[model samples]
Target chain A: HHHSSGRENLYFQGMHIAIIGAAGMVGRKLTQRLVKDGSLGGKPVEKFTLIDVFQPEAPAGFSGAVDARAADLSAPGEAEKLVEARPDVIFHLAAIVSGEAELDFDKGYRINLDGTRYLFDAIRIANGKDGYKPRVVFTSSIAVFGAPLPYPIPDEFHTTPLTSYGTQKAICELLLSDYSRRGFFDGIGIRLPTICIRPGKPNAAASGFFSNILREPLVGQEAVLPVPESIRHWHASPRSAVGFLIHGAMIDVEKVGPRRNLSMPGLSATVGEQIEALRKVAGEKAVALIRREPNEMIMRMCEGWAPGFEAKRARELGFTAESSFEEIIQVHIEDELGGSLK
Target chain B: HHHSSGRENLYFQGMHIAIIGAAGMVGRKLTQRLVKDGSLGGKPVEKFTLIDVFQPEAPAGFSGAVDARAADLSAPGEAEKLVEARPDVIFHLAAIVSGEAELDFDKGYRINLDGTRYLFDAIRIANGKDGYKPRVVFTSSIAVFGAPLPYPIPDEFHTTPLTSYGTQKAICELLLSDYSRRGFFDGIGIRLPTICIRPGKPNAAASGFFSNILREPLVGQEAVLPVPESIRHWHASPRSAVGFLIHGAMIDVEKVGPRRNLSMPGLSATVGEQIEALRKVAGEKAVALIRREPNEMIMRMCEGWAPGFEAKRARELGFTAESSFEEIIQVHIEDELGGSLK
Candidate 1:
């Protein structure tokens, strides 16, 4: 993006960044943001590595060297290979997400839980070897909060997740806190809300409805609204999600103290409110694109999800998100639809 | 141990019980209690399986067939072999002790975490094949709650454990809940308080002093007080711990619903109060055996340790404990000292 005003010279030793799931939507944006900004925490990134299950697209305009590789994290020795380079910052954004994890138990646990432990253990061993500590950031999710939830879940509410995926995330968060406590590595877990208005084709996952209803209708395509209009849930724009990860990567973990895992700030909105925002942005024609499917299973799962979070600590730590559904729609239009709707 | 009431005839087909780590103090006592009662929940146990790293002692009066075998849980196919007999109730009490786990990280996670997973997954696969759902009672610990904890930690307070042992326990609790929710098994996680008046020679764990000061002094032996009189923590008698496990096995899983984990009821007392309780039971000469030795590391941990708990839910669910430290000492006299002090 343009000229920097001596920000790149803030650190004498250049930075090396690593993105574990760089092919994913959020990871791609995060990589691009780091490339565009040219620095993180006033440290100019001299080189960065991008890794995923498949080779990630090489982004343009980055002066820094890139090590784009395809690797499955669950494989033995892979995590050690990733750590061998000793990158200054590492972002772990990969997961065998909720519905899929619930459907395929063995693969989910193998990929999500086992792979995470391998990486964490690698860091701990590396720390013991030569006291090599790096900033480690992980993407957790609001799925950690399950049913019989309190409205506006406080910062201290227990995580009793109902799904296998949520269980995996919650367990990883515990490991992150413990590893950080042991001084193996500086770690932060960003528990993100449902990423709304996702810029992708809607799949059949129960939660896909949240993004589909908005993203599809914006481009004049019909989308299924599975749950009731009054069903409420927490959300953040994909832009804001990347920001949370970036912020988490460079956050002052000392201030976070023992509680390294955090429930990030998010917009609490009902499905009805989303429709209203769609109407405001793209009129009744766009609102009409939402078909009322009313799936019972989806509704039941949604009830168990996080309606919202108080997120007092995260906000104080400088994490932020969309305040209104209208703003969320605007973000989708600007980023995915080239700043205007048809 | 001889008398059998009509309670045994309540169930036509007898109960089959399984105890993993049946050689440990609590597990041994739990086995004795089950055999003495000759029944659990009015059902006569026709057979029981006892598995530990070492073959457990053959209790003198168990008429029920005993399947005592030595096994390491983390080993391949061990958990599946344990599940093959399909015991009606299973109590998993084995774990790499806290200090040991902290010192040897790999062994701790291997035994405590990986082993627990192997057991749970074995049950899940079994559930799919034959619809076998057993009552699983897991012994969690107060270590799951760390410092900066709220006074009288509420039922809903988050688990941010500071130790790897606690982290492993907390992770297992999450797994237990998720497994229960999925209809794989009827699992209950009983988060135990520190067992007081421990009836054995104390070797040096930080929390061991809590028992040593009270237990040693009652028998006219000198015991060192590591922390100050004001250092407060949660406590229950070992007798009561067995009761908690047995109660957990029989309690209505339906009533517990989604929240399968519970912090047990215990008499929250300060060291000063414990000394007073000893003073009340054994007079001045017995109390005089106490020697003071302040350990900074122990004191530092004691400062953040759980002083007490409100324990409303457990109490509501018929889980009871000793009301005072005096009663706790009385239990030790009855159980370990044969109902009479010197």
Candidate 2:
């Protein structure tokens, strides 16, 4: 499985990393990528604290150096317990999905808003004894910006979120920026675009359909296309998302410049464009694999989703990803499906 | 006592008027003016509900009906109990002073932020039976807006409050505007300039020094002018503050058009100019009684206190008040001291 640009330093050597949602899809891959070379910087990952609802599997073979624990983040004593572990870098990727949040008010607010606040407060107070101020990279979303937006969303558009989940993320972003500015912790909110061609079993996420149409049919299975073929969406490959997280963990934040929150680079294309990309890679056979079974409920929800961002600030900061729809499709094929286009 | 050339009507003939801080300097005169047949649309009030921590003396010789209540506004259920009494219009002028608010965080948030939220919630739920949206004119201070302002403060300056008190007021203003917009109450937030030539024994309010130098010396009492004579301050008469409230209460909000919060017109002048106004009004005798004794703390705080608002929006809506330093001083002398200036 040796890939291009494979290097000994691929693992974040010597760095102690804490993943809040280590068991989650993106968090697991991000953790695996860091520990692939055993050592992150030159020294091995001295300690890896993997935390989620249940203990996550320790990275491949290094069980002795890792501490995996389970804690419900919304509980009263949970934030304090996590902060006590004192990892050098923290990955805050845990959150309820947008659709589920809209359905369950109290549960969503507790985990999304209150839990994030508790973690921040705990970090601020934890700056004692060891006086550790860890680097925290938060996974924000495009949902932070609402509709009637100027197409190609810029950095300055006021955050008028359309949903409760988006509102919570916007609030957390403000809190993260303010708290970091106040010297509590080094925090960066990455407003990740729809992580397309996500390598996993499709679940209940509304954004899941974006990946399903492209991903499911590629393995010679019938894929359900929920919306009209003309519908556009913003997409980034899972490889690029994992790459973004690693880049976030290492970079000199000061050089990242003033706008701390970023809209990561993504390919904007309609459903027709995705199918064309699919045709170029796997031909008419794979194109015929997509089953056009439109679901009205899914289409209505997808209609309001933002198609893309200009992301001038992030590009200026040297973070990059799939620049085209074909490249995004190729990333999923080569990385996850053994580089087979036929 | 009858003033001429004014229109008359019977819109408020028997409606009860309640002034929550009736014993305070601002509240006392606000009550006095209402009892003396002051009507927005020629409506005379027949009943009054006066409330303060210390019971106020009734307005002189004018009593159709009166019910006096004294209680701490911060006490649990106090505002709800009061709202249950069901006064037609409520002017909530009570607040802990700015200096006291900065000194104690808990007391400040409790009395200022929590108290206002509780009162609004109570009033909103209380009259929900027949959809009662009472005309609520709450007096908000200039404290809601803080420094780093663009020369002339705009109506939409993003609220970046510099103090806890300002933060609380700005938060309450947000809730108030949202509540009003949602049809919860007919609410208006009037940001008043510091009442100048204030007729009272000068208390320790930082803004009080602005008036102390002028009014105290005019009455042949030695007054300490604490700041530089060139220091500028915003000024409106106590009468104008009441006028702003009365205008806000009756103006068919439909015609006032959309923005429920407004900045009232006030004269902005330097301390040297205020002394000059006293000399012009009461001659050389008043100017000679002034004593210059500078306090650095008071001077520093005064530097950021507002000097003026380019209130084009409020003025365009036909809400006019005292627009000069001369009228400000005369109004205080005649209304509070029972005599004309000089």
Candidate 3:
């Protein structure tokens, strides 16, 4: 009995939007993109419910109503409260990073696993009451892929995640697919690649250096390179990441079938390739700022990370990212550096 | 710290064994098999903790002490109470079946998904104490794979379960892997095929027809064949199913590595092949009892089921099943029919 809003016209006629973990990097970018477009899937924005552990600032120039709140979805009653409003589309981008989740098991399960369940369950309950079926766009990560990764990981690969965070994400992906199959909600999970040129100061995550090496050096600052230049990883820029989420929200789920989660297309690059891109996009000066501070622990950790993905399903369904390392750098220069060399 | 019970000797010494779903078909067979063996990995059975929604009968002729309990693991504190005993090895074979879980959503998630979590979490908590790490043997299902499956589903294929029951099992697989990786338990998940010639009267499950047609016809009784003779499915004898669980409980998890779950080798056969096996084993008189009812619902549901698997990893790691429908039928005759025509 779900999907009863008087069809496509009702969907395109001023829809409500909710952003869980709105304060996070991709969430912020997504919100900005939504506000800039002033529409989604041809619908005029009606409302935006932004939520995070720390309340995010309301997106500037959004004509629609912005309801921003500091909230923990894992806390009692919070998930139900979020669902009470019955937003037309929800972006669940919240999760503890790899390093933190590994360090704190209970906390990781609580926030990443349990919290996602609460939100999904709340929606299920809401659907039971009045048939409120929303488009649920969940942000999973390439962390869902672990060791012995095949080069250009296929859409059909098993998810034997080696980390707690990846496990949580993979579990949520299962839940999303199940819930969607049951018709409680129209859900789509996009397993994002590591967001390149992360537009912020470096955090403590082991993966942070991937972004730091580029973001910092591009801004004429010293950045540590803990792994060898040969270490390869999958990546997509922040712009591309937000674009994937937007595409996920607007796509025809009927085309997706039962396998609702997708490994998003991304650029596969070694550290050497990333460095070359940095040199090509910026200058030799930018490349020189990348300090070789090899840390064995981080390098060991990096070994298990993914090199690339085939991402056939997503690509076929129109989800895309930069095709080359140089294109990834150019995206950063354009989107993060205001269309000029920093 | 987890594998520290004086290592090899401690494992081969008399050890406590617990079966969560002790009353079910495979569970009962597993219990009987253990009773026959009198030992696991050369360790004498000191005791057996048998639990289910209904307390199971103690295996006859077993010298070990039996602690049988009627309990719901989903009930509050029950999992914790179970974990407090600190059994040397835990076999979690409990779950609401496919049809019931599909009919009752919340009940399914409660018993299958939440119940499994509680048990794993309880074990994790216990491990946090004096390091009570037990071997956790989980029974997952081929239901974990859904429609559009490859001819021989490879070990690397993704788990996009099409049913709520499959979702729960898939979720538990992830939990088992994560918990095992964290050193809370030595876990191995074996995805069993549809247990052929299920030893007993017919049940309400949609898949029950698969067993009923053979089990009943072998006894010179009429049984409905709901789907077409052409539909193929993965299958294993009840005997082989029991063997997989036993092997899972005793295998070296170090050899399994991070991918704790595996698809156990199974016989892939069509309905026509099943009838052919019945004719070969029990003569044309037995095969004549199969009445073609051809239910559309069952056929539609069967379409989403697994056809076959490569199961190379599990085969390499020493798990085995019947290679042909005739072998499957022969095993059933030996185990269930007392080596005579029913």
Candidate 4:
């Protein structure tokens, strides 16, 4: 919604935009935002190509050309066909979640690593053909950081991902940086925090509890609290996640230099603090709906997660998020609860 | 050459070993050492498979089987054929040098990144067939750490490589760790410091001058000093580089856990300090054979090069190197200069 100051002419004007995994939660939100504005960087978005494993729905009332399709990125020739359209901006947000990736090794590597490479290679080949270097905004995750982590993890902290999903993401991050350096594509990787208070049913993710504890209770449904109140973790709302993607696509990547991947700004909160915020936002009745049923497996898993990050670099670069758990809860109420508590 | 400590029965006996890039400097040294010893970890090396882009010469007077062949690793089916025999230990030391990689983007990523992946994937496929998991010793580089660096970079410092070669190595390291974790192969990535006082002719590596300034002058030849004497960088002798390879192969990878890659120990020194060490080892006249003709390109490249590293983990793991510039120069004299300086 914000305009680029002085650099409006440099932004993608009358350009085609493509969104992989457009049916996903954050992807849908981003699509809605784009449709609402109808332009990016003070210029019209000429076309929107939405793609996902399942058919994605095109937003209503978007005057620009909208084409939504069901496509598997890892399938042979699929990525090349998508790139053949020569979209000016590509948002690659498709991947299996952590728990799923760990369970199915082949599927994880196939979709996450190989599929990403196919898309990137297609872009590189197109660039070689006629120097069509589109801006690629990739959504990575905080899972890149694993156990034995330092509190307030610095940007310089090593990425020793413990899970297969994290490994795939970390590898992709390296590829993105290298490809951008080689001038194949203008790429930016946003390492987003765990998107909290998600507006949906709890999925199979081990991290689902982080969102479940707050999300279900506000809707007058009971939710499970797998870990203790003392356990702390980094988080950002879906709104903020969508905001980071928008900013990443529009930002001047020259300022990012060689380090194209950035740890986006996020809130660090403990379970106790999250509950307190929930209570403040929705009162004792909603807070009472959260059932404390400690899960050993999840507790062990949670230990390896980063409590927070020193995202000073991202903040200075104009990427922002919710300041506190209270703000995050308020966002959930406003966005999902229709500006009212149950 | 050395036996496993109190674990002779645990070590591989009468097993086949393979070395990729066996024609290169470090590879040749490693092959010679293995041949000279006739065994590794108290077991006879029944066969040695040496594969390189050029034909690698077989070591003299070795009773065991020796198969030396010229092969392009990046070429399709080459990697799969190499894995057909399924050697007990594989030392993957092949790659284009930094300067060559930076000069040719496609070739660099092809051989370095894709070639390495091909080998790893071949091994993984073999594991899937019959659970044949071999010990893989990968030679990574300190180039993985680039500019905006901290002095004495810790093991946990983020790898933001400024060069394509470095990026390839970093990506390989991630793959190594993940594959090892997944029980495909027992992999260990040894991030070798700059091999200084390198034997034989000077190469086109950007950091080649690091060795030339010392190597040429001691042999009664003038060597060009491209950068200021204040330029500090990490270094180890060819002897130490080979030692690291042996240790990496012999060690239990379980000790390394998930983070399979390590920054090896080395002597960090400046050009001025190196000259002083040369004067101590040889005479002041040897130091006087250095020519000063500043090259802006080389100087700028040197700025991003690592001056030193903490290397605490490697040191603790029994990977030793030169303690000082004096020792490094001494190693050159003993090993390359026929036990004496000119």
Candidate 5:
């Protein structure tokens, strides 16, 4: 019943948009893209509701109404209030990072799993009352896949989450699909690759090294290479991550069918290939800054991490990303580094 | 840790056992097996606590103490009370069947999804204090797999549940694995096929026709075949279903590893083949008892249902089932029909 409204107009249609986890990097980038364009698929976005654990800043140069607030989604009644506005397109990018979730199990299930459910349920309840279904674009991760894995994990691979964080993400993905199937919401879950050259301070996520190695070296700072040069993993730039979110928000639900979750297309590169790409992009000086000091714990963790994915569905569905490690590095330099060598 | 106790003694060792949904066909068969055998894995059976939405009847021949009660696991404090006994092995088979779940969404999630979590969380909370992890054998289903499937669906195929019942089961499977991985419980999920020749009155389950055509015609009653003769599906007898549960309880966790959920083995037979087997067992008169009345609803539902499965993991791990439909019918006649043809 709630699915009736959104089908008539494929785009936002001067509809209100909401961004959960708006204070985070990709969330911020998505907000900027929404604000700068002021339209999605030829329809003007009328307003924005930005929510995060911290208050998110409203983007400049947008005439639409913006309600940016600090609210914990897991808190009772908080998520219900977020649904009161009934945003047409909700970008749900909120989650606790892997390191924190693994260290604190309860907090991981509370924020990542329960909190996400609260938001989805709130929407469901609203639909039950007034039939208001929204397009929910959820950001899941490649972390949903785990070790003892086949190389280039196919679209058909089962999710055996090795960590609490992955379990939370996989659970939410299931919920998204179910909710969509029941017509409580129009949902799409995109399992993102590790974001390479993440701009800013290094976070506690185990996957942080994927970005730290490149980001630090680009700015003439020393970075630790925790795994061997042969260790391979999937990656994409932050710019591409936001692009995937946008595509997810606007894509036709008909093409997606009942399997709403998809592993996003990304570049598969080894650490050695990454260093070589660094050499190609910024010469030997930047590559030399990457110190080869292997850590057993990280290497063991990396072994379980996905080396690559055959994201055939996402590609066929028009979702795309960088083709090579060199392109990924260049994207970082262009987007975050002012296109200058340090 | 809770795991330390059970490993020292590979069997029950006079340890108490709990069976949720003890009133159902599989649950009752499992209870009878435990009571009759008097031990599991060469350990003396101690006691039984049988729970169900409706009060379950105690097995006739058991000398062991039996506490049977009517209880809803979804109700507040009910699951916690059920765990207070700290049964060494818990067989969780309780659920709202597919037809009912599809009709009532909220009830399905509450009983199948939330009730399972309540039990798992109650265990986790207990573990937080004194570490009381029990071996949990969960009953999942082929319903977890949906359409656009590969022929002979492999163990690695993703779960994209098309029905609310399937979604709930899949969610519980994920939770079981995660909790097991976290040292909360030693968990194993067995995805059982449609129990052919199911005893008792016809239930509202969408797959009831699978059993109806066989059970009724064998007893000189007319049965309707809602689907075409060409329709094929996976099936196992009530006796083998019991065997699977026993094997699941006694199977080595080290062999199963962290990917605790397994698709159980079953015979794949077309409707025409089933009729042929019926004729082989009970003569042409029994085959003539099946009425051909095709229903579009059941046909559409059967289309999404699994044709067959590789179930390679279960086979490799020594889980066995009826090799042919004839044997399955023979087993049914032996067990339920007093080994006599009407």
Candidate 6:
């Protein structure tokens, strides 16, 4: 979505766009951004399709043609039904979260692997005489990489995923690449780092606390820091997160070639650095709101996670994110809080 | 089956055996080797389970102890069904051929990836509680390595599979290693070189001609040589293939440690070397049986293939194959012709 309003007469007039998981956090923001000047890169966003397990909240004041529908993706014929209209661009942002996926093995495999495959095959079957070729923008995670990694992981590192969730994601990456190679469709997979300083209430995502520790504390709530301060990882602000989606959808897959996948560049910082940034932003008073009561259960789960990546190929491809933890915090304030923390 | 007759039964006394793909070309020969009287550390035959897509004929004199069964492995319930009737050692000698898999994507994924997963998962479910760790000996191929390689591939070199078949084999290797690491099962993946001088009629496999040119010619029949005499490739005899399976199943996974997969040592030779060996055994009369029919179609297919591999790890672990192409041809003749080539 291009939010270039109050400037020109650029708007979607005769193009189609489909957004899956449109009710979720990133999905809603993406919908809002696309609502304004819907000619994503110059083509009119004439027709819009929003799909989810539940009906997505319709974008306010959208004059462009639209369809909002809900269906259980794992059900028979659901994927086919969702894409039968043949939208020009597809934003696949739906997935069971890491924690939920790890806890429920069957749900994880069924939804993550089988459901995603069903949708992909559905699109392949839905092409018309003109041969509808949609731009597939899939959102993946750093969990695709496994544990006992070689310090700072490189772009060419082997994807030896340890968890079931990671394994499913790795499998999907292979399928995405192969399908793209076969000219079934134009595709790209972005391995997003944890979205940090998340501007909302606490959630059950295992990586949620990385943002919650700073976000909740600044909003005057006692946030529990379950993991150790030395735990380092990669992240990007919500603004950069949405930016990644935009870039992935519009980028030339020909340039990316047959691989059809990228590890999106993100801010690499330790938890201690995050807390220091939080202290600098909202003062020591807010920092005191953080209650570090180490939970062994959570620590064990987080231990197997990768710290960060070198992302040389991603940088070469012209997609980027915050350079430091401090920069990420400042971006969160500038975009989400009008450059002023409340 | 434990071949422990007329000896102290020091090697395989009462060890149970399971043979997958028993109806296929190599599997049929392997089944004979296991059932009938054969030396195993100076011992002979006992009991076995010969599993295949259909019931394959077992060797004579051991019909009472050999149980041959027919089953489609890709089906849902088959893996668990086989696991319920437990075998202490399993040789997973099953897969769709490379060329066929490359041509058909869905069929390849169904049989190679999903079928393997079902077997691994089934073992976990059936033996998790009892910790009944069975030796899962998986036969992988050298197809996992791709181009821009280091001329002669090393044991620790990364897997960059160019074809769907190669990708599936590499994925299965990763899963086997992980499952073994988790103590769910004791698994070992053997990357077998392409079997040279393969007996019987040539099949549709692109690599089939690599053997046909030698096998069919020496047996007083016309043989087609598709690739040029300059083409070099890695190879081993069917006898060595059997030896690899046995060694892999019996070797302790602990000694192998996290490097659960091994590249089987084989004869690395050129087409000229293969013909030279064939001529040495059956004279120029047999060599004249081979017709030089150079085809560009087969040359392009053989371009990315690895002619040699440093199987240092496997050799150190007591696994070995033919030392040279000459020995491999000799072994093939002795086994298939019973030392009476005339």
Interface RMSD of each: 0.7, 5.5, 0.5, 0.8, 0.6, 2.8
> What's the C-alpha lDDT at position B242 in model 1?
97
Q: State candidate 3's DockQ.
A: 0.85
Per-model CA lDDT versus the true structure: 0.90, 0.75, 0.90, 0.91, 0.90, 0.79
Candidate 2, B155-248: lDDT as tens digits: 5443444566765665565556645654768888788888877777888887677778777876778888878877876778877887887887
**Tens digits of per-residue lDDT for model 4, A1-342:** 776556545444498999999999988999999988778876688899999998999888788898899998999999999999999999999998777888888899899999999999999899999999999999999989878898899989999898889999998999899899989999999999989978889987788899998998888999999899999999999999999999999998988888999999999999999999988888899999999998999999878889999999999999999999989988988888899863
Score residue A9 of candidate 5 by CA lDDT.
Answer: 61
The complex in candidate 5 yields a DockQ of 0.76
Per-candidate clash tally: 0, 7, 0, 0, 0, 7
Cα error of candidate 6 at position B227, Å: 4.4
Show the colliding residue pairs in model 4: none
lDDT of 6 at A222: 84
Candidate 2's error at B312, in angstroms? Answer: 4.5
* Model 6 Cα lDDT, one tens digit per residue, A153-225: 8776666677667767777777676667666778899888888878888887666789888888766788999
RMSD of 3: 4.5
Model 1: lDDT of residue B125: 92
Chain B TM-score, candidates in order: 0.96, 0.90, 0.95, 0.95, 0.95, 0.91
Q: Where does the lowest 10-residue lDDT sum fall in candidate 2 chain B?
A: B153-162
Q: Can you give the lDDT of residue B45 in candidate 6?
A: 41
Question: Who wins the DockQ comparison?
Answer: 3
Q: Model 4, stretches more than 4 Å misplaced?
A: A1-12, B1-12
Query: Candidates 2 and 5: which is better by DockQ?
Result: 5
For all the candidates, what are their Cα RMSDs to the real structure? Answer: 3.8, 8.3, 4.5, 3.8, 4.7, 5.6
* CAPRI-style quality class for the chain A–B interface of candidate 5: medium
True contacts kept of each: 0.92, 0.00, 1.00, 0.73, 0.78, 0.08
